Structures are given as structure tokens and as C-alpha cells.
Amino acid sequence: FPRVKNWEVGSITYDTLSAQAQQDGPCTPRRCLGSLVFPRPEQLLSQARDFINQYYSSIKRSGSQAHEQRLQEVEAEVAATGTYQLRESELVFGAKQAWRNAPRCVGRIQWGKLQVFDARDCRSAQEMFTYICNHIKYATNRGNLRSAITVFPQRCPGRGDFRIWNSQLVRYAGYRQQDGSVRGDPANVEITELCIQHGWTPGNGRFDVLPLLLQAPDEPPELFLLPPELVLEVPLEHPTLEWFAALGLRWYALPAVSNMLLEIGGLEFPAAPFSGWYMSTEIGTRNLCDPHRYNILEDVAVCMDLDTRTTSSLWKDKAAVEINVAVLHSYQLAKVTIVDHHAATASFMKHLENEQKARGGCPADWAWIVPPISGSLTPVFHQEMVNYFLSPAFRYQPDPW
Amino acid sequence: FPRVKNWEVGSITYDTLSAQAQQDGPCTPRRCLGSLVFPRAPEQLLSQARDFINQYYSSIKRSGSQAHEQRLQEVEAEVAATGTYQLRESELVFGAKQAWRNAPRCVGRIQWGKLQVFDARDCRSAQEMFTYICNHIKYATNRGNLRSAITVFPQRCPGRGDFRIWNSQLVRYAGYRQQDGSVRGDPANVEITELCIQHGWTPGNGRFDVLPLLLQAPDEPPELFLLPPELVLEVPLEHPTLEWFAALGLRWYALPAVSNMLLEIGGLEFPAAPFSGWYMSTEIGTRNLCDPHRYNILEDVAVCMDLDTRTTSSLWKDKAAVEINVAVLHSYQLAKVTIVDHHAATASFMKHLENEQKARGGCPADWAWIVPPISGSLTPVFHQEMVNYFLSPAFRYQPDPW
Ligand code: HEM
Ligand code: HEM
Ligand SMILES: CN(C)CCc1cc(F)c(F)c(CCc2cc(C(F)F)cc(N)n2)c1
Ligand SMILES: CN(C)CCc1cc(F)c(F)c(CCc2cc(C(F)F)cc(N)n2)c1
Ligand SMILES: C[C@H](O)[C@H](O)[C@H]1CNc2nc(N)[nH]c(=O)c2N1
Ligand SMILES: C[C@H](O)[C@H](O)[C@H]1CNc2nc(N)[nH]c(=O)c2N1
Ligand SMILES: [Cl-]
Ligand SMILES: [Cl-]
Ligand SMILES: [Gd]
Ligand SMILES: [Gd]
Ligand SMILES: [Zn+2]
């Protein structure tokens, strides 16, 4: 069992949970591939059986009547239909465990509080749209954000897939110009061109909220314009730098991942959007300052009158900290839930300790738990971590085109 | 072959060199252990040696030649006769450079070919060892214009114990367990400090007392040697616009000189081969001064800066850390001691990656050690996927000799 050391304190633990690793990952004794983002018939019963045993142990009901019982109906359901339906409580328990198991999520101290909307009787793109709209309004909650997930019908053979084509529920547009370069978000250029292709009237701005492309099975996608009063956004200002507001920067309140695939007990939900609240460095450091994203770092440094002529003035570092300061200040002033990377990582250290006593370990992806600014200033930096795959899980999935 | 993306540009390469990785690391398809700091007969000596000679003869564009097969047969005959073999001098220079080139956690490897190799394989005693080390320090420091170098002491061999430098670096500050429970000085060096005192060193009581050297000749107890103060170049730390910073009394030393790692060349082992370069400012500014278990100055700096330390969301920690790094850079530049910042360092490592892809079809890199400890995604290496694996020649960790 792997020895895991914390270098700030000197404490040691052993990850015994690592034994249960289902889907083998990308690494071999010959080379480590841990830094790679994407690492390149009736077996349905194996995963269903084990998931059901998970559920009943977690309610202290292993080896007792209702557990014995439930094992048989899944047997008979697959015997008859080739698949099975999840009990409500199980679907809820499975959604929370997928989150709990996500190795790259630093927010997992919250995994126990998740609102699960059952949209398994969904039947059309227009139905999806109102399901998604209930979620958003519920999650957003006038800025007192509440974690939530909506689970659309599980995939079945011979029939089309429910899919959301946008990577998130809120995405800004990305437009090319008379010179190739991009106005707006360069991460969403591809999806912006799909939305225009399917009938959307493109705006002229740098923060145009894209419309949703929702895919009912075996039909094409359909464009859905989001109600603007339902997309809560935060104009960005700085507490002491009065010109920052004039830069016109904005970001949205609800981070809502709408392209990942929920797998519970061998069942696959290709449309299962989940949402929580942002950590400030996601917006301030990655979204606004990545060179391939909004790339605002030099513009803010000019306004701060910084010496951009030498890298050793650390002008980049100074401008980045102030951009994060403005994000936190803005979200707080607008009363929108947000968490800074110091509070977030301290909470994750507490999650690690809980998980050690509860399950004997915790799958964690060091490169993604450590924040993208001030890494060694947070406690997770000095914490050794073990990465592996447990089920149920959120999985990446191909684009439906 | 593993495919490797640069997420900032869209670049894609394939690490074909990883397939030749001989020795194994800690990961499996079950679980990744990349974040662990310490992830760890004549026939097998023969095959390592054979592979190294092949490497050397490739480098001098003489692969397969007369001299190449001569040297292969020579080494096997010497392994048969003596159980070991001896490197020629040029083979030792080439192997020391490759060992730096192959070090996956080193961001300064653009410089790998510019390495001064001192051959001390004739060294006889701890006293001679000390003389060689002082000459190494003098040459590398070079009055603040630092030069990369390595001194190679005699190889491990059966029948005799190893040369060992007990100190983890040639320049270290003492750490004295205090009155209450605190450490005065560098807490990372409590153990080695205690070892020096128990070997007859008279301690000081400052925060920046330079430690003596404990030097081990074969089958000898370690022997204490003091470094002449004028050999150890140091830099008082000041801040360009925070004049109270000078009153903190902080200093750091010019020469980073790792002295406790094992150099492996073609199966041969050099347990004592100290090497030195120059610092990147975040090792001093972020790790050495701001780590909670090191000098831990962050809160004191932020309080002096009049930051609000009662709430995390004011980003006082980030603000104070940026200014500590400014101070380190400004102080080394003022003092005319070589130093590189994490933006320039990570950008020349990107060129290294590119040179290495052309030269060898990839480059072993340990992402979590390459990405700087502050302002990570502001540097280009953050957005570069990397493949970590073990190539030989190599610097390896080894157990402490006590
Ligand atoms: C409640 C507060 C939450 C915070 C502060 C938070 C924060 C983060 C951050 C910073 C990442 C880094 C991934 C990246 O940069 O791409 C991440 C990943 C992830 N989170 Fe959370 N998250 C929260 C809630 C949730 C919820 C409710 C779920 C699911 C029910 C979830 C599931 C995931 C998954 C699957 C990933 C990996 C996705 C990827 O890396 O592409 N998180 N989270
Ligand atoms: C010339 C300037 C150099 C710079 C700027 C530099 C930079 C760095 C940095 C920042 C690290 C990681 C530090 C840490 O442990 O936190 C590192 C590690 C390392 N460097 Fe370099 N280095 C330089 C020269 C050299 C030389 C000359 C050698 C050997 C010939 C070398 C071999 C290594 C090795 C083996 C490691 C890994 C040690 C470990 O595991 O911590 N470096 N370097
Ligand atoms: C890596 N970044 C820079 C690119 C954009 C990006 C790519 C992803 F794959 C991705 F999942 C995300 C959101 C992660 C996330 C998810 C959640 C949850 F509640 F929904 C909350 C939160 N705070 N963050 C963002
Ligand atoms: C948390 N850190 C401090 C770990 C301690 C530590 C362990 C090591 F093995 C190690 F080599 C170092 C220095 C790396 C280094 C080496 C060199 C070279 F010229 F010698 C130059 C440079 N700039 N840096 C530090
Ligand atoms: C636990 C974690 O892997 C450990 O603290 C590592 C992370 N990355 C690092 N990177 C460098 N350059 N030096 C270090 O000491 C570390 N420490
Ligand atoms: C190459 C590297 O692994 C990759 O760019 C990762 C590193 N860690 C990350 N961590 C988060 N949270 N988001 C990211 O996009 C990345 N990028
Ligand atoms: Cl985002
Ligand atoms: Cl150091
Ligand atoms: Gd001005
Ligand atoms: Gd001043
Ligand atoms: Zn790995």
C-alpha cells in the first residue's frame, strides 16, 4: 500500500483505497503520463452488482433483506430487458459518489451536499431546455449558489443519445476577424461556429452568452436562446484600482459542466449537467489570463504602469494577483458565492483527512488540485497524492459530431 | 508512443525516447505516484556499460567503428578480470553532461552542454577531498559570475567503502533546536547540524550560520572541515521599494551545490560527485523563505506591508510572496551574482524541450517539479504536457550514510 507523506507536517498515511481501482489509467512502470489532460454482451452486471453492494454498505445494510432483494431485481431486469433502472436513492447516491471520486476536483469537501434532479423521463429537446432552466435557476438562487446535477435518460442500444453540445451551460462567444484573430473567448470558437451554423444571429461583443444546442435522440440539435435574466453575471471592478471597471470585464456566476458522462453501476448518462460555484483562480488566472484565453495580463499591467520591459520586474505576477483580487471583490460585492484558492485548498486538506478515516484514502490529481497561482503557498502543494479511477465516476466523452 | 500536447499553442509531439527508458519508476496502470518526492552480478553491469559506450560513440559520430568495438571488447575483458572497469576521461565528461541532460526535475537543462567537469578520481583522503571541493566552490562562484561545474570523486568499488559528502549541499545554514520548541535558522538542516556538533563543531546561534563540511573517505569516520568565510559568497536581501525589508536581516548564498546525490554512468557509481549551477529566484524567494516548514517569513512580511492578514481573500499571502521574490532578484542583481527568474527559466526550458525533440525524440520532464511554485500557469511549461521517465546516465538519490 502506497506510502503518502505530507512534507509540511511530516505526517504519513497509506492509501488502502487505491486497491479498488477499476479503469486502469495512463501510467506504466516505464513512464508517467499524469500531466496529460485527456489520456488518449453482458458485462453490465459486474458493475451493477458492485455498485449495489456499495449502496447498501453505505447505509449499513450489507447482508440483510433489502440488500439480498435488490440484487435479484437487477438480475431479472437485465435478464429481461438487457439493462436496468436505478432506484431514486441509488441514483442520488451514485451522483454524489461520482463527485466524491473526481480526482481533479478540489471542491470535494462539499460532495455530501448535492441536489439531484431526476430527468430520466425526458423526451425532447424542448423538455431538456426546461429541465436545464430549472437547474440553472435553482443552482443560481440569486447568487447563493447551490450544487446541483440533472440526470437525463441513460443511454440504451439501438437508440440515439441525449447530449448537450456546449462544454458548459454558460459560454461566451468567440469570433474570428478580417485577420484570423479572435474577439471573445478563444476556447469556444468551434462551438460559436456551430451555433451560427444552426441559425444563431451572432453578436458583436466580447462577452456574448452563447445559446444552447440540445440534442434529442436521433434528431439533429436545436438552438435554444437562454433567458438573459437567468444568466447571472458579475461585472468586474477592483477595490482600489478605479480604472479596472472601465476595462469592461465580466464573468458568469454558475460554472456548469455540460459535456461529461456520468457512469453509475455500469449505466451511462451522456447528458448529466452538474454545477457548483467557482474558485476565484479559475476565472482570474486561467480564463482571463491564459495566453490562449482572454489574455488580458499585459493590458492590466499597462494600466498599473508596470515595467513590462523586463521579466524580472515580476510585472506578470503583480497584474495576475490584482486580477484575482478584482474577481473576489466583484463576486463578493454582487453577493455571488465564490471561494479563493487558499480557503479552497485548506478545505481540501480537511477532505483528505475525512476521506482517510472514512474510506482509507482519496484519489487526487496533484497537478489539478494545486492552484495555478501561488502553488506552494497552499497546503496541497506539500501533500503527496495518489491518483486512480474509482466508480461511479464522471468520465470524458467524445464530441457528438 | 505517448502523444504530448502544448495546450497554449496547439503543438503536438510524440515522445519516442520514452520507449528506451530502461529503469522503472513508481507508477502502474492502477495508480499514478508521480507526486511522490522519493519514488524509490557482472552480466547486468555489462549491459549498462555496453549501452553507455554505444551512447558515447554515437555522440562522437563514430558508432560501429574500429575504436567503438575495441572499447566494447576492452570493457568486457576488464569486467571479467576485475569485476568492474574504468572510464576514459572523455567518457566521464560526456557521461556527467548526459546525467544533467537526463534529470527530469531540472528546469535549467538548456545549459546541459556547458558543464565544467573536474576529475578527482585520484583523490586519496578526506583532506584532499576538501581541497578539491574548495577549488570547485572557487571556480563555480567566480566572484558572482557563476559557472556550472561538477567534481567527480572515486567510483564505488568492491573492497573499499565510499567517499561521501554528508552535507546535502556544500552551502547550508545551521538549524538549532531552540529553547521552547522552535528552530533558529533553517529547519531543513536540524539533523545535519546535530551531526556536525556531535563531531566537534562549535555551534553559533544566528539564523544564517554556514555549516562545516562532514567528509567521509573510504572506511573512515567523517571528518569536519570549516569553509573559509571568503569562499562562501552571500547576498544580503533588500527590497527596491520597501526599505524596511533590509532590517529583516535576511541573506542567502550564491552557489547552489548539491553534494549528496549519486552519479551513475554505464553501471558505475560515483556516490560523491557534487555539482553546482546558479539559482532560480523562486527556490530562494518562495520555497526557502516562505515554506511554512522553512524560514516561514510570509506573515511577518505581509504585516510589515500593511496587508490585511485576517482574511484569505485579500490575497495577502500572494502579495507578500511576490515582493519577497522581487527582493531576491533585485538583491542578486545589485550584488552581481547570477540569478534567473521563473519566467526566463521556464521559457528557456521550452527551447530545451524543442531542441531535445529534434535531437532525441523527446525529453524526460517531471511537470510538478518543472512548473514554478508561484505563478505556475503564467509560465509556458504549465500548458505543456510532459512524459516522466528514467534515462541513464543519471543522478540518483541515495540513503544518508548515518
Ligand atoms: C462546489 C464547489 C466546487 C468547486 C470550488 C470546484 C472546483 C473545481 C476545480 C477548480 C476543478 C479543476 C478542473 C479544471 O480546471 O478543469 C474541478 C474539477 C472537477 N469537478 Fe469540481 N468544483 C466544485 C463542484 C463540483 C461538483 C458539484 C461536481 C459534480 C457533481 C464537480 C465535479 C468535477 C469534475 C468531474 C471535475 C474534473 C473535470 C475536469 O477536470 O475537466 N465539482 N472542480
Ligand atoms: C545552471 C542553472 C541551474 C538551474 C537554474 C537549475 C534549476 C533547478 C531547479 C529549480 C530544480 C528543482 C529544485 C527543487 O528541488 O526544488 C532543479 C533540480 C535538479 N537539478 Fe538543476 N539547475 C541548474 C543546474 C544544474 C546542474 C549544473 C545540474 C547537474 C550537473 C543539475 C541537476 C539537477 C538535478 C539532479 C535536480 C533534481 C534534484 C532533486 O530531485 O531535487 N542542475 N534544478
Ligand atoms: C481548465 N479550465 C481552465 C478550462 C475550462 C474548464 C474545463 C473543464 F473541463 C472544466 F470541468 C471546467 C470547470 C471545472 C469546475 C466544475 C465545477 C462544477 F461544479 F461544475 C465547479 C468549478 N468551480 N469548476 C472548466
Ligand atoms: C524543496 N527543495 C528545496 C528540495 C531540496 C532540494 C533537493 C535537491 F535534490 C536539490 F537538488 C535541490 C536544489 C536544486 C538545484 C540544483 C542546482 C544545481 F546546480 F545544483 C541548481 C539549482 N538552482 N537548484 C534542492
Ligand atoms: C508533495 C509534492 O510532490 C512535493 O512537495 C513537490 C512538488 N513539486 C516540487 N517542485 C520542486 N521544484 N521542488 C520540490 O520540492 C517540490 N516538491
Ligand atoms: C499540461 C498540464 O498537465 C495541463 O495543462 C493541465 C495542468 N493542470 C491543470 N489544472 C487545471 N485545474 N486546469 C488545467 O487546465 C490544467 N492544465
Ligand atoms: Cl470555467
Ligand atoms: Cl536550495
Ligand atoms: Gd495614468
Ligand atoms: Gd518605500
Ligand atoms: Zn504517473
Swiss-Prot record, chain B:
Region described as Interaction with NOSIP: spans on this chain: 31-402
Expression by tissue: Platelets, placenta, liver and kidney.
Positions annotated to bind Zn(2+): 27, 32
Residues binding (6R)-L-erythro-5,6,7,8-tetrahydrobiopterin, per UniProt: 35, 287, 368-369, 382
Location(s) in or outside the cell: Cell membrane; Membrane, Caveola; Cytoplasm, Cytoskeleton; Golgi apparatus
Binding site for L-arginine: 169, 278-279, 283, 288
Binding site for heme b: 106, 397
Family, similarity comment: Belongs to the NOS family.
Role: Produces nitric oxide (NO) which is implicated in vascular smooth muscle relaxation through a cGMP-mediated signal transduction pathway. NO mediates vascular endothelial growth factor (VEGF)-induced angiogenesis in coronary vessels and promotes blood clotting through the activation of platelets.
Oligomer and partners: Homodimer. Interacts with NOSIP and NOSTRIN. Interacts with HSP90AB1. Forms a complex with ASL, ASS1 and SLC7A1; the complex regulates cell-autonomous L-arginine synthesis and citrulline recycling while channeling extracellular L-arginine to nitric oxide synthesis pathway.
Protein's UniProt name: Nitric oxide synthase 3
Organism: Homo sapiens
Lineage: Eukaryota, Metazoa, Chordata, Craniata, Vertebrata
Gene responsible for this protein: NOS3
